[PDB]
Write a protein that binds this ligand. Sequence first.
Ligand SMILES: CCCc1nn(C)c2c(=O)[nH]c(-c3cc(S(=O)(=O)N4CCN(C)CC4)ccc3OCC)nc12
Ligand SMILES: [Mg+2]
Ligand SMILES: [Zn+2]
Length: 326
Amino acid sequence: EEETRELQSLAAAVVPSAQTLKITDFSFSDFELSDLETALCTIRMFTDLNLVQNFQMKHEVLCRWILSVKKNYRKNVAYHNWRHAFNTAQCMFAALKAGKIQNKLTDLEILALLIAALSHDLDHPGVSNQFLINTNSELALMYNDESVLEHHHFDQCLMILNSPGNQILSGLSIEEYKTTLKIIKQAILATDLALYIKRRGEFFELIRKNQFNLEDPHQKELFLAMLMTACDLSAITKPWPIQQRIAELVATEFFDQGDRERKELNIEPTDLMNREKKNKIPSMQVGFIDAICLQLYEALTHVSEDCFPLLDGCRKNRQKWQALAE
Ligand SMILES: CCCc1nn(C)c2c(=O)[nH]c(-c3cc(S(=O)(=O)N4CCN(C)CC4)ccc3OCC)nc12
Ligand SMILES: [Mg+2]
Ligand SMILES: [Zn+2]
């Protein structure tokens, strides 16, 4: 049996310190790590955020839950796979520790954010919401064309949290368990960039006016949404060699969607989805940075100056892509 053999390699392995694993570093790369090592790093994130302790999680159950999450990503999808989820969670961990956000949030909020980060792209098919709408997918029918993928990832998140031996939330009060599932749903839906674009203006306005206040529950929920997007997009902040490699993965997934469009829908893909247009990736990345990323990382740095490395890396990669676009 291959599954029991993975569980045993994992629950008996020593979990190295966060310092040894480099998971506190905003610049962290997963590329040299084995699958088992990514699982050990995940355990370390739950432990050093005091979640295992504060929520009385049994080791074996956390181990089983992590391996269930990992297995429920599609390995053949080029970008939206377990490594992206793992890296998103790692960025969350770095933001909370190095970025000093941990002290601004409750243990219950942190718990939800970490589970949401790990689960937020579960079972991603490697095509966009717009593709799912255009093909009349059963998912888009179930969810009325609204954040289709994200509703699906949340469904998958609940399926895993409820599977026998994977119940990492069992130590909570019933009221706190319900509140936590609601925060997880909000966090996963927030990763729909359509919702990011709708909500960002309010966030930026509060910061511009010098009025942002995390003690206000509405502003706190807005912040959690923004933080999820910041972690989700964080490959754009990484050291140049890592960003170049990840950008190639993103483009591979987009081009594969375009190939499906050309055959299943008989349409001409747009340049973003057309492999013929690979030479345009530098200009497309500069556009992505300018339209979406820069202002988000600027805004996050206002909330915590210790998150500056994310902004710094984003700006460095903009220069690198712009030089290739010329
Ligand atoms: C859903 C994927 C979001 C995303 N994550 N990361 C790390 C990237 C990235 O590096 N690039 C792009 C990207 C965005 C645009 S875009 O801003 O123009 N954009 C197209 C996609 N939609 C959904 C939003 C707008 C164009 C090209 C891109 O990648 C080329 C490798 N998207 C993401
Ligand atoms: Mg997603
Ligand atoms: Zn994602």
